[PDB]
Protein backbone atom coordinates (compact mmCIF):
# COMPACT_ATOMS: atom_id res chain seq x y z
CA UNK A 1 0.00 0.00 0.00
CA UNK A 2 1.20 3.56 -0.68
CA UNK A 3 1.22 6.57 1.66
CA UNK A 4 -1.34 8.59 -0.33
CA UNK A 5 -4.90 8.95 0.96
CA UNK A 6 -8.02 10.91 0.00
CA UNK A 7 -7.34 13.66 2.56
CA UNK A 8 -4.38 15.02 0.57
CA UNK A 9 -6.62 15.80 -2.43
CA UNK A 10 -9.65 18.04 -2.80
CA UNK A 11 -12.14 19.20 -5.39
CA UNK A 12 -11.59 16.00 -7.40
CA UNK A 13 -14.40 14.14 -5.61
CA UNK A 14 -16.35 14.18 -8.88
CA UNK A 15 -13.59 12.06 -10.43
CA UNK A 16 -12.90 10.25 -7.15
CA UNK A 17 -16.42 8.82 -6.83
CA UNK A 18 -15.90 7.31 -10.28
CA UNK A 19 -12.78 5.58 -8.93
CA UNK A 20 -14.59 4.44 -5.78
CA UNK A 21 -17.06 2.55 -7.98
CA UNK A 22 -14.22 0.66 -9.71
CA UNK A 23 -11.61 -0.84 -7.36
CA UNK A 24 -13.21 0.18 -4.04
CA UNK A 25 -16.94 -0.58 -3.88
CA UNK A 26 -16.96 -3.83 -5.95
CA UNK A 27 -14.29 -5.24 -3.63
CA UNK A 28 -16.20 -4.65 -0.38
CA UNK A 29 -19.66 -5.08 -1.95
CA UNK A 30 -18.64 -8.27 -3.81
CA UNK A 31 -20.97 -10.20 -1.50
CA UNK A 32 -23.85 -8.19 -2.99
CA UNK A 33 -22.73 -8.71 -6.60
CA UNK A 34 -22.56 -12.48 -6.08
CA UNK A 35 -26.15 -12.57 -4.82
CA UNK A 36 -27.31 -10.22 -7.59
CA UNK A 37 -25.20 -11.94 -10.25
CA UNK A 38 -23.95 -8.59 -11.56
CA UNK A 39 -20.36 -8.67 -12.80
CA UNK A 40 -18.14 -5.91 -11.43
CA UNK A 41 -16.32 -3.67 -13.93
CA UNK A 42 -13.05 -5.23 -15.06
CA UNK A 43 -11.30 -1.85 -15.11
CA UNK A 44 -11.51 1.90 -15.60
CA UNK A 45 -10.04 4.09 -18.34
CA UNK A 46 -8.23 7.27 -17.27
CA UNK A 47 -7.22 10.03 -19.69
CA UNK A 48 -6.82 13.80 -19.85
CA UNK A 49 -4.02 16.35 -19.87
CA UNK A 50 -0.83 14.77 -18.49
CA UNK A 51 -0.63 17.32 -15.68
CA UNK A 52 -3.62 15.94 -13.79
CA UNK A 53 -3.71 13.95 -10.56
CA UNK A 54 -4.36 10.65 -12.32
CA UNK A 55 -1.15 9.32 -10.76
CA UNK A 56 -2.16 10.74 -7.36
CA UNK A 57 -5.83 9.71 -7.51
CA UNK A 58 -4.94 6.14 -8.48
CA UNK A 59 -2.38 6.18 -5.65
CA UNK A 60 -4.89 7.36 -3.04
CA UNK A 61 -7.29 4.53 -3.94
CA UNK A 62 -4.64 1.80 -3.58
CA UNK A 63 -3.91 2.57 0.09
CA UNK A 64 -7.56 2.53 1.16
CA UNK A 65 -8.10 -1.00 -0.17
CA UNK A 66 -5.15 -2.38 1.85
CA UNK A 67 -4.41 -5.07 -0.74
CA UNK A 68 -1.42 -6.26 -2.74
CA UNK A 69 -0.53 -3.77 -5.48
CA UNK A 70 1.29 -4.50 -8.75
CA UNK A 71 2.75 -1.77 -10.97
CA UNK A 72 3.44 -2.59 -14.62
CA UNK A 73 4.57 0.01 -17.16
CA UNK A 74 3.50 -0.40 -20.79
CA UNK A 75 6.88 0.63 -22.31
CA UNK A 76 8.57 -1.97 -20.08
CA UNK A 77 6.66 -4.71 -21.95
CA UNK A 78 8.95 -4.32 -25.00
CA UNK A 79 12.40 -5.90 -24.71
CA UNK A 80 15.12 -7.00 -27.12
CA UNK A 81 14.54 -10.65 -26.16
CA UNK A 82 11.45 -12.05 -27.86
CA UNK A 83 8.96 -13.60 -25.45
CA UNK A 84 10.35 -11.87 -22.36
CA UNK A 85 7.74 -9.13 -22.68
CA UNK A 86 5.05 -11.71 -23.42
CA UNK A 87 5.90 -13.45 -20.13
CA UNK A 88 5.55 -10.14 -18.26
CA UNK A 89 1.80 -9.88 -18.84
CA UNK A 90 1.50 -13.66 -18.49
CA UNK A 91 3.24 -13.57 -15.10
CA UNK A 92 1.52 -10.33 -14.06
CA UNK A 93 -1.86 -12.06 -13.78
CA UNK A 94 -0.13 -15.18 -12.44
CA UNK A 95 0.42 -13.26 -9.20
CA UNK A 96 -3.33 -12.55 -9.25
CA UNK A 97 -3.89 -16.30 -8.73
CA UNK A 98 -1.93 -16.96 -5.52
CA UNK A 99 -3.17 -13.61 -4.20
CA UNK A 100 -6.68 -13.22 -5.61
CA UNK A 101 -7.58 -9.50 -4.32
CA UNK A 102 -4.80 -7.57 -6.05
CA UNK A 103 -4.55 -4.33 -8.04
CA UNK A 104 -2.70 -3.94 -11.35
CA UNK A 105 -1.78 -0.51 -12.72
CA UNK A 106 -0.83 0.19 -16.35
CA UNK A 107 0.76 3.57 -17.05
CA UNK A 108 0.55 5.14 -20.53
CA UNK A 109 -1.91 2.76 -22.16
CA UNK A 110 -1.18 4.43 -25.51
CA UNK A 111 2.42 3.18 -25.29
CA UNK A 112 1.44 -0.30 -26.53
CA UNK A 113 -0.71 -0.45 -29.63
CA UNK A 114 -1.03 0.29 -33.34
CA UNK A 115 -2.32 -1.04 -36.67
CA UNK A 116 0.50 -0.61 -39.23
CA UNK A 117 -0.46 -2.80 -42.16
CA UNK A 118 -1.15 -0.82 -45.34
CA UNK A 119 1.62 1.79 -45.29
CA UNK A 120 5.38 1.34 -45.53
CA UNK A 121 7.71 -0.40 -43.02
CA UNK A 122 5.23 -3.30 -42.59
CA UNK A 123 4.77 -2.24 -38.98
CA UNK A 124 7.00 -3.45 -36.16
CA UNK A 125 5.40 -6.42 -34.29
CA UNK A 126 7.86 -6.11 -31.39
CA UNK A 127 5.04 -4.22 -29.64
CA UNK A 128 1.68 -5.82 -30.52
CA UNK A 129 2.93 -9.15 -29.13
CA UNK A 130 2.50 -7.99 -25.53
CA UNK A 131 -0.76 -6.32 -26.59
CA UNK A 132 -2.25 -9.68 -27.59
CA UNK A 133 -1.37 -10.94 -24.10
CA UNK A 134 -3.59 -8.22 -22.61
CA UNK A 135 -6.47 -9.50 -24.74
CA UNK A 136 -5.84 -13.21 -24.10
CA UNK A 137 -5.11 -13.10 -20.36
CA UNK A 138 -8.17 -10.98 -19.53
CA UNK A 139 -10.26 -13.45 -21.56
CA UNK A 140 -8.64 -16.40 -19.75
CA UNK A 141 -8.83 -17.58 -16.14
CA UNK A 142 -8.84 -13.87 -15.22
CA UNK A 143 -11.91 -11.57 -15.24
CA UNK A 144 -13.16 -12.88 -11.89
CA UNK A 145 -13.45 -9.18 -10.89
CA UNK A 146 -10.54 -9.56 -8.49
CA UNK A 147 -8.16 -8.74 -11.37
CA UNK A 148 -9.39 -5.15 -11.85
CA UNK A 149 -6.75 -3.03 -13.58
CA UNK A 150 -6.34 0.75 -13.48
CA UNK A 151 -5.61 1.96 -17.03
CA UNK A 152 -3.94 5.38 -17.14
CA UNK A 153 -3.28 7.03 -20.51
CA UNK A 154 -2.81 10.55 -21.84
CA UNK A 155 -5.18 11.09 -24.78
CA UNK A 156 -7.85 9.02 -26.51
CA UNK A 157 -6.64 9.80 -30.04
CA UNK A 158 -4.14 7.00 -30.72
CA UNK A 159 -5.26 3.69 -29.23
CA UNK A 160 -6.25 0.19 -30.29
CA UNK A 161 -10.06 0.19 -30.73
CA UNK A 162 -10.09 -3.40 -29.40
CA UNK A 163 -8.80 -2.42 -25.94
CA UNK A 164 -12.28 -1.55 -24.59
CA UNK A 165 -14.70 -4.36 -23.72
CA UNK A 166 -17.04 -5.35 -20.91
CA UNK A 167 -14.34 -7.85 -19.90
CA UNK A 168 -11.44 -5.38 -19.86
CA UNK A 169 -12.35 -1.72 -19.27
CA UNK A 170 -15.88 -0.49 -18.48
CA UNK A 171 -16.11 2.95 -16.86
CA UNK A 172 -14.38 5.66 -18.91
CA UNK A 173 -13.40 8.37 -16.42
CA UNK A 174 -12.71 11.77 -17.95
Amino acid sequence: KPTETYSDVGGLDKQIEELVEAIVLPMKRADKFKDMGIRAPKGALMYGPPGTGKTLLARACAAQTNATFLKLAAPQLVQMYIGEGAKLVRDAFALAKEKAPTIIFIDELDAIGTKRFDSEKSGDREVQRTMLELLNQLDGFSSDDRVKVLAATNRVDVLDPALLRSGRLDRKIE
Binding site: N136, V156, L159, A162, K172
Partner: protein
Protein backbone atom coordinates in the same frame (compact mmCIF):
# COMPACT_ATOMS: atom_id res chain seq x y z
CA UNK B 1 -10.51 -54.08 33.76
CA UNK B 2 -11.65 -52.52 30.48
CA UNK B 3 -9.88 -49.22 31.19
CA UNK B 4 -6.39 -50.55 30.45
CA UNK B 5 -7.68 -52.69 27.56
CA UNK B 6 -9.35 -49.79 25.74
CA UNK B 7 -6.12 -47.77 25.90
CA UNK B 8 -4.21 -50.53 24.09
CA UNK B 9 -6.98 -50.98 21.51
CA UNK B 10 -6.57 -47.34 20.50
CA UNK B 11 -2.80 -47.80 20.26
CA UNK B 12 -3.29 -50.89 18.08
CA UNK B 13 -5.08 -48.72 15.52
CA UNK B 14 -2.06 -46.39 15.57
CA UNK B 15 0.29 -49.34 15.05
CA UNK B 16 -1.37 -50.26 11.75
CA UNK B 17 -1.22 -46.59 10.75
CA UNK B 18 2.55 -46.61 11.29
CA UNK B 19 2.92 -49.86 9.33
CA UNK B 20 1.81 -48.01 6.20
CA UNK B 21 4.30 -45.25 7.04
CA UNK B 22 7.18 -47.73 7.38
CA UNK B 23 6.86 -48.97 3.80
CA UNK B 24 6.09 -45.47 2.52
CA UNK B 25 9.34 -44.17 4.04
CA UNK B 26 11.34 -47.17 2.79
CA UNK B 27 9.89 -46.67 -0.70
CA UNK B 28 11.26 -43.11 -0.65
CA UNK B 29 14.81 -44.48 -0.51
CA UNK B 30 13.86 -47.08 -3.12
CA UNK B 31 12.64 -44.28 -5.40
CA UNK B 32 15.91 -42.37 -4.90
CA UNK B 33 18.00 -45.44 -5.80
CA UNK B 34 16.78 -45.19 -9.40
CA UNK B 35 18.76 -43.21 -11.98
CA UNK B 36 17.87 -41.00 -14.92
CA UNK B 37 17.00 -42.23 -18.40
CA UNK B 38 17.54 -40.39 -21.68
CA UNK B 39 14.57 -40.03 -24.04
CA UNK B 40 15.10 -39.88 -27.79
CA UNK B 41 13.54 -40.71 -31.14
CA UNK B 42 14.88 -43.27 -33.61
CA UNK B 43 16.21 -41.61 -36.76
CA UNK B 44 17.77 -44.30 -38.95
CA UNK B 45 18.24 -48.05 -38.49
CA UNK B 46 21.91 -48.98 -38.76
CA UNK B 47 21.53 -52.72 -38.12
CA UNK B 48 19.42 -55.22 -36.19
CA UNK B 49 21.08 -54.59 -32.81
CA UNK B 50 22.51 -51.18 -33.80
CA UNK B 51 20.20 -48.16 -33.97
CA UNK B 52 20.73 -44.42 -34.39
CA UNK B 53 18.64 -42.43 -31.91
CA UNK B 54 18.75 -38.64 -31.65
CA UNK B 55 19.04 -37.44 -28.06
CA UNK B 56 16.74 -34.70 -26.80
CA UNK B 57 19.74 -32.36 -26.57
CA UNK B 58 20.50 -32.75 -30.29
CA UNK B 59 23.49 -35.13 -30.47
CA UNK B 60 23.09 -38.59 -31.96
CA UNK B 61 24.65 -41.87 -30.87
CA UNK B 62 24.70 -45.53 -31.89
CA UNK B 63 22.86 -47.43 -29.15
CA UNK B 64 22.34 -51.12 -28.46
CA UNK B 65 19.31 -53.18 -27.50
CA UNK B 66 18.22 -55.41 -24.63
CA UNK B 67 16.04 -58.50 -24.22
CA UNK B 68 13.24 -56.56 -22.48
CA UNK B 69 12.26 -54.60 -25.61
CA UNK B 70 10.82 -55.58 -28.99
CA UNK B 71 12.85 -54.56 -32.04
CA UNK B 72 9.64 -54.27 -34.10
CA UNK B 73 8.70 -51.05 -32.29
CA UNK B 74 12.30 -49.76 -32.20
CA UNK B 75 12.22 -48.67 -35.86
CA UNK B 76 12.31 -45.07 -37.07
CA UNK B 77 9.57 -42.62 -36.16
CA UNK B 78 9.08 -44.09 -32.66
CA UNK B 79 10.25 -42.38 -29.48
CA UNK B 80 12.29 -44.69 -27.24
CA UNK B 81 14.25 -44.50 -23.97
CA UNK B 82 18.05 -44.42 -23.86
CA UNK B 83 20.58 -44.82 -21.05
CA UNK B 84 22.65 -42.00 -19.55
CA UNK B 85 25.66 -44.24 -18.78
CA UNK B 86 26.27 -46.90 -21.46
CA UNK B 87 24.00 -45.18 -24.04
CA UNK B 88 21.71 -48.12 -24.75
CA UNK B 89 17.97 -48.65 -25.15
CA UNK B 90 16.30 -49.53 -21.84
CA UNK B 91 12.49 -49.24 -22.03
CA UNK B 92 9.82 -48.15 -24.52
CA UNK B 93 7.55 -45.14 -24.01
CA UNK B 94 4.58 -43.85 -26.04
CA UNK B 95 5.33 -41.21 -28.64
CA UNK B 96 4.98 -37.63 -27.39
CA UNK B 97 6.81 -34.89 -29.31
CA UNK B 98 6.98 -32.08 -26.70
CA UNK B 99 4.57 -32.93 -23.86
CA UNK B 100 3.33 -29.41 -23.08
CA UNK B 101 -0.10 -29.99 -21.55
CA UNK B 102 -1.15 -26.36 -20.98
CA UNK B 103 -1.08 -25.97 -24.77
CA UNK B 104 -2.83 -29.31 -25.37
CA UNK B 105 -5.57 -28.99 -22.74
CA UNK B 106 -8.07 -26.15 -23.11
CA UNK B 107 -9.33 -26.21 -19.48
CA UNK B 108 -13.00 -26.71 -20.27
CA UNK B 109 -15.49 -25.46 -17.67
CA UNK B 110 -19.04 -25.26 -19.00
CA UNK B 111 -20.47 -21.74 -18.73
CA UNK B 112 -21.86 -20.37 -22.01
CA UNK B 113 -23.69 -22.71 -24.39
CA UNK B 114 -25.28 -22.32 -27.83
CA UNK B 115 -28.21 -20.60 -26.07
CA UNK B 116 -25.91 -17.93 -24.62
CA UNK B 117 -24.41 -17.00 -27.98
CA UNK B 118 -27.93 -16.63 -29.35
CA UNK B 119 -28.89 -13.88 -31.73
CA UNK B 120 -26.08 -15.07 -34.02
CA UNK B 121 -28.21 -18.08 -35.06
CA UNK B 122 -27.86 -17.05 -38.72
CA UNK B 123 -24.10 -17.60 -38.31
CA UNK B 124 -24.48 -20.27 -35.60
CA UNK B 125 -26.18 -22.79 -37.89
CA UNK B 126 -23.44 -21.96 -40.41
CA UNK B 127 -20.66 -23.20 -38.10
CA UNK B 128 -22.32 -26.41 -36.90
CA UNK B 129 -22.60 -27.72 -40.48
CA UNK B 130 -18.85 -27.48 -41.18
CA UNK B 131 -17.79 -28.43 -37.63
CA UNK B 132 -20.28 -30.63 -35.78
CA UNK B 133 -21.50 -32.51 -38.86
CA UNK B 134 -18.13 -33.64 -40.33
CA UNK B 135 -16.89 -34.67 -36.88
CA UNK B 136 -20.07 -36.77 -36.42
CA UNK B 137 -21.23 -38.16 -39.80
CA UNK B 138 -18.32 -37.65 -42.24
CA UNK B 139 -19.97 -39.87 -44.87
CA UNK B 140 -22.26 -36.98 -45.86
CA UNK B 141 -19.38 -35.09 -47.49
CA UNK B 142 -17.92 -38.33 -48.87
CA UNK B 143 -21.12 -39.26 -50.73
CA UNK B 144 -21.15 -35.95 -52.62
CA UNK B 145 -17.38 -36.14 -53.14
CA UNK B 146 -16.39 -32.82 -51.54
CA UNK B 147 -13.52 -32.69 -49.09
CA UNK B 148 -14.26 -31.64 -45.49
CA UNK B 149 -13.23 -28.06 -44.71
CA UNK B 150 -9.99 -27.64 -42.76
CA UNK B 151 -9.77 -24.07 -41.48
CA UNK B 152 -12.56 -21.76 -40.34
CA UNK B 153 -12.11 -17.99 -40.01
CA UNK B 154 -14.08 -16.15 -37.31
CA UNK B 155 -13.77 -12.36 -37.50
CA UNK B 156 -15.84 -9.26 -36.84
CA UNK B 157 -16.00 -6.11 -34.74
CA UNK B 158 -14.69 -6.36 -31.16
CA UNK B 159 -17.24 -7.02 -28.45
CA UNK B 160 -19.48 -9.44 -30.37
CA UNK B 161 -18.40 -12.50 -28.37
CA UNK B 162 -15.81 -13.97 -30.73
CA UNK B 163 -13.86 -15.17 -27.69
CA UNK B 164 -16.99 -16.86 -26.32
CA UNK B 165 -17.36 -18.75 -29.62
CA UNK B 166 -14.47 -21.01 -28.61
CA UNK B 167 -16.08 -21.91 -25.27
CA UNK B 168 -19.56 -22.30 -26.77
CA UNK B 169 -18.57 -24.90 -29.38
CA UNK B 170 -16.35 -26.65 -26.82
CA UNK B 171 -19.23 -26.96 -24.33
CA UNK B 172 -21.17 -29.18 -26.78
CA UNK B 173 -18.85 -31.48 -28.76
CA UNK B 174 -16.79 -32.24 -25.65
CA UNK B 175 -13.77 -33.42 -27.65
CA UNK B 176 -10.18 -32.24 -27.23
CA UNK B 177 -9.35 -28.59 -27.89
CA UNK B 178 -5.92 -26.98 -28.33
CA UNK B 179 -5.64 -23.28 -27.49
CA UNK B 180 -2.55 -21.71 -29.08
CA UNK B 181 -2.21 -17.96 -28.45
CA UNK B 182 -0.27 -15.95 -31.00
CA UNK B 183 2.30 -14.25 -28.76
CA UNK B 184 2.73 -17.22 -26.42
CA UNK B 185 4.38 -19.44 -29.04
CA UNK B 186 6.72 -16.73 -30.37
CA UNK B 187 9.26 -17.37 -27.60
CA UNK B 188 12.66 -17.00 -29.22
CA UNK B 189 14.57 -20.25 -29.73
CA UNK B 190 16.40 -21.99 -32.56
CA UNK B 191 13.99 -24.13 -34.58
CA UNK B 192 11.34 -24.06 -31.84
CA UNK B 193 9.05 -21.46 -33.44
CA UNK B 194 8.40 -23.65 -36.50
CA UNK B 195 8.30 -26.81 -34.36
CA UNK B 196 5.29 -25.70 -32.28
CA UNK B 197 3.01 -25.79 -35.33
CA UNK B 198 4.40 -29.22 -36.27
CA UNK B 199 3.36 -30.38 -32.78
CA UNK B 200 -0.37 -29.64 -33.00
CA UNK B 201 -0.67 -31.48 -36.32
CA UNK B 202 1.44 -34.37 -34.99
CA UNK B 203 -0.68 -34.78 -31.85
CA UNK B 204 -3.84 -34.64 -33.99
CA UNK B 205 -3.34 -38.23 -35.16
CA UNK B 206 -2.88 -39.89 -31.75
CA UNK B 207 -5.28 -37.65 -29.79
CA UNK B 208 -7.92 -37.84 -32.60
CA UNK B 209 -8.51 -34.96 -35.06
CA UNK B 210 -10.86 -32.97 -32.76
CA UNK B 211 -10.43 -29.19 -33.12
CA UNK B 212 -7.37 -26.92 -32.96
CA UNK B 213 -7.97 -23.29 -31.99
CA UNK B 214 -5.94 -20.15 -32.74
CA UNK B 215 -6.52 -17.05 -30.61
CA UNK B 216 -6.06 -13.53 -32.02
CA UNK B 217 -3.12 -13.89 -34.40
CA UNK B 218 -2.12 -10.47 -35.76
CA UNK B 219 1.55 -11.33 -36.31
CA UNK B 220 2.57 -14.18 -38.60
CA UNK B 221 0.24 -13.07 -41.40
CA UNK B 222 2.39 -10.12 -42.41
CA UNK B 223 4.59 -9.66 -45.46
CA UNK B 224 7.35 -8.23 -43.21
CA UNK B 225 9.49 -6.01 -45.37
CA UNK B 226 13.04 -5.96 -44.05
CA UNK B 227 14.01 -3.09 -41.76
CA UNK B 228 16.26 -5.54 -39.92
CA UNK B 229 13.20 -7.28 -38.46
CA UNK B 230 14.72 -7.04 -34.94
CA UNK B 231 15.18 -10.78 -34.28
CA UNK B 232 11.67 -11.57 -35.60
CA UNK B 233 13.05 -13.73 -38.44
CA UNK B 234 12.13 -16.66 -36.19
CA UNK B 235 8.51 -15.66 -36.84
CA UNK B 236 9.04 -15.92 -40.61
CA UNK B 237 9.64 -19.68 -40.40
CA UNK B 238 6.45 -19.88 -38.32
CA UNK B 239 4.42 -18.57 -41.26
CA UNK B 240 6.24 -20.92 -43.65
CA UNK B 241 5.35 -23.92 -41.48
CA UNK B 242 1.66 -22.96 -41.39
CA UNK B 243 1.48 -22.60 -45.18
CA UNK B 244 3.30 -25.84 -45.99
CA UNK B 245 1.15 -27.80 -43.53
CA UNK B 246 -2.12 -27.27 -45.42
CA UNK B 247 -0.43 -28.17 -48.72
CA UNK B 248 1.46 -31.08 -47.15
CA UNK B 249 1.02 -34.64 -48.37
CA UNK B 250 -0.16 -35.86 -44.95
CA UNK B 251 -3.80 -36.83 -44.44
CA UNK B 252 -5.81 -33.79 -43.32
CA UNK B 253 -9.35 -32.43 -43.44
CA UNK B 254 -10.57 -34.23 -40.32
CA UNK B 255 -8.85 -31.79 -37.95
CA UNK B 256 -10.57 -28.39 -37.76
CA UNK B 257 -8.46 -25.22 -37.52
CA UNK B 258 -10.29 -22.36 -35.80
CA UNK B 259 -8.40 -19.08 -36.31
CA UNK B 260 -9.91 -15.90 -34.87
CA UNK B 261 -8.54 -12.38 -35.28
CA UNK B 262 -9.57 -8.75 -34.90
CA UNK B 263 -9.37 -7.98 -38.63
CA UNK B 264 -8.73 -10.39 -41.52
CA UNK B 265 -6.36 -8.26 -43.61
CA UNK B 266 -3.46 -8.73 -41.17
CA UNK B 267 -3.56 -12.46 -41.97
CA UNK B 268 -1.41 -13.93 -44.73
CA UNK B 269 -3.16 -13.47 -48.11
CA UNK B 270 -1.72 -16.89 -49.00
CA UNK B 271 -3.95 -18.31 -46.25
CA UNK B 272 -7.02 -16.24 -47.17
CA UNK B 273 -6.93 -17.62 -50.71
CA UNK B 274 -8.55 -21.02 -51.33
CA UNK B 275 -6.53 -24.19 -50.83
CA UNK B 276 -5.72 -23.51 -47.16
CA UNK B 277 -8.52 -21.55 -45.47
CA UNK B 278 -11.79 -22.47 -47.20
CA UNK B 279 -14.16 -20.94 -44.61
CA UNK B 280 -14.59 -17.23 -43.89
CA UNK B 281 -17.34 -16.72 -41.29
CA UNK B 282 -18.13 -13.11 -40.43
CA UNK B 283 -19.76 -12.14 -37.13
CA UNK B 284 -21.17 -8.65 -37.84
CA UNK B 285 -23.49 -6.52 -35.73
CA UNK B 286 -26.70 -8.48 -35.03
CA UNK B 287 -30.01 -7.22 -36.37
CA UNK B 288 -32.90 -5.87 -34.29
CA UNK B 289 -34.19 -9.39 -33.60
CA UNK B 290 -30.74 -10.77 -32.80
CA UNK B 291 -30.01 -8.39 -29.94
CA UNK B 292 -33.34 -9.17 -28.24
CA UNK B 293 -32.26 -12.73 -27.43
CA UNK B 294 -29.06 -11.50 -25.76
CA UNK B 295 -30.75 -9.24 -23.18
CA UNK B 296 -32.57 -12.26 -21.73
CA UNK B 297 -29.23 -14.07 -21.45
CA UNK B 298 -27.49 -11.48 -19.27
CA UNK B 299 -30.64 -10.85 -17.21
CA UNK B 300 -31.30 -14.56 -16.59
CA UNK B 301 -28.92 -15.35 -13.73
CA UNK B 302 -28.99 -11.69 -12.61
CA UNK B 303 -31.80 -10.90 -10.19
CA UNK B 304 -34.32 -8.65 -11.96
CA UNK B 305 -37.89 -7.38 -11.67
CA UNK B 306 -40.73 -8.84 -13.72
CA UNK B 307 -41.05 -5.47 -15.49
CA UNK B 308 -37.60 -5.87 -17.11
CA UNK B 309 -37.58 -4.25 -20.53
CA UNK B 310 -37.91 -6.26 -23.74
CA UNK B 311 -37.63 -4.43 -27.07
CA UNK B 312 -36.88 -0.86 -25.94
CA UNK B 313 -33.25 -1.58 -25.04
CA UNK B 314 -32.49 -2.11 -28.74
CA UNK B 315 -34.03 1.26 -29.63
CA UNK B 316 -32.06 3.12 -26.94
CA UNK B 317 -28.59 2.26 -28.27
CA UNK B 318 -28.36 2.48 -32.07
CA UNK B 319 -25.00 2.86 -33.80
CA UNK B 320 -23.07 3.70 -30.62
CA UNK B 321 -22.28 0.07 -29.71
CA UNK B 322 -24.77 -2.49 -31.06
CA UNK B 323 -22.29 -5.23 -30.17
CA UNK B 324 -21.42 -5.69 -26.49
CA UNK B 325 -24.53 -5.68 -24.29
CA UNK B 326 -22.71 -6.95 -21.16
CA UNK B 327 -21.49 -3.38 -20.54
CA UNK B 328 -25.12 -2.41 -19.86
CA UNK B 329 -25.50 -5.15 -17.24
CA UNK B 330 -22.52 -3.85 -15.25
CA UNK B 331 -23.64 -0.21 -15.33
CA UNK B 332 -27.18 -1.09 -14.20
CA UNK B 333 -25.90 -2.36 -10.84
CA UNK B 334 -24.56 1.03 -9.75
CA UNK B 335 -27.93 2.79 -10.08
CA UNK B 336 -29.57 0.33 -7.67
CA UNK B 337 -26.91 0.84 -4.99
CA UNK B 338 -27.63 4.57 -4.71
CA UNK B 339 -31.36 3.86 -4.28
CA UNK B 340 -30.73 0.99 -1.81
CA UNK B 341 -32.40 -1.77 -3.81
CA UNK B 342 -31.29 -5.33 -4.51
CA UNK B 343 -33.46 -5.62 -7.62
CA UNK B 344 -32.69 -3.47 -10.66
CA UNK B 345 -35.09 -0.69 -11.61
CA UNK B 346 -36.38 -1.22 -15.18
CA UNK B 347 -35.96 2.53 -15.71
CA UNK B 348 -32.37 2.32 -14.46
CA UNK B 349 -31.77 -0.47 -16.99
CA UNK B 350 -32.64 1.97 -19.78
CA UNK B 351 -30.40 4.59 -18.17
CA UNK B 352 -27.47 2.15 -18.17
CA UNK B 353 -27.95 1.60 -21.92
CA UNK B 354 -27.92 5.35 -22.54
CA UNK B 355 -24.69 5.71 -20.54
CA UNK B 356 -22.84 3.28 -22.84
CA UNK B 357 -23.24 5.71 -25.77
CA UNK B 358 -20.55 7.98 -24.28
CA UNK B 359 -18.46 5.15 -22.80
CA UNK B 360 -16.69 3.90 -25.93
CA UNK B 361 -15.59 6.80 -28.17
CA UNK B 362 -13.11 4.34 -29.71
CA UNK B 363 -14.34 4.78 -33.32
CA UNK B 364 -13.47 1.39 -34.88
CA UNK B 365 -16.22 1.45 -37.50
CA UNK B 366 -15.68 -1.57 -39.73
CA UNK B 367 -16.83 -1.43 -43.33
CA UNK B 368 -13.46 -2.71 -44.64
CA UNK B 369 -13.27 -6.21 -43.10
CA UNK B 370 -16.11 -7.74 -45.13
CA UNK B 371 -13.67 -9.29 -47.61
Amino acid sequence: HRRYDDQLKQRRQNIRDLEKLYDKTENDIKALQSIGQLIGEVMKELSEEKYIVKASSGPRYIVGVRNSVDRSKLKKGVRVTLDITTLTIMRILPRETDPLVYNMTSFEQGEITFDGIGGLTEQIRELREVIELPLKNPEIFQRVGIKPPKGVLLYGPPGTGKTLLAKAVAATIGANFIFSPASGIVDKYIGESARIIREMFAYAKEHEPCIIFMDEVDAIGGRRFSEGTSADREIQRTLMELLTQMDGFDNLGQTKIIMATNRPDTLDPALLRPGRLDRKVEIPLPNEAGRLEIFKIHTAKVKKTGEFDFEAAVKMSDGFNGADIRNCATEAGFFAIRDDRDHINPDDLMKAVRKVAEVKKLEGTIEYQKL
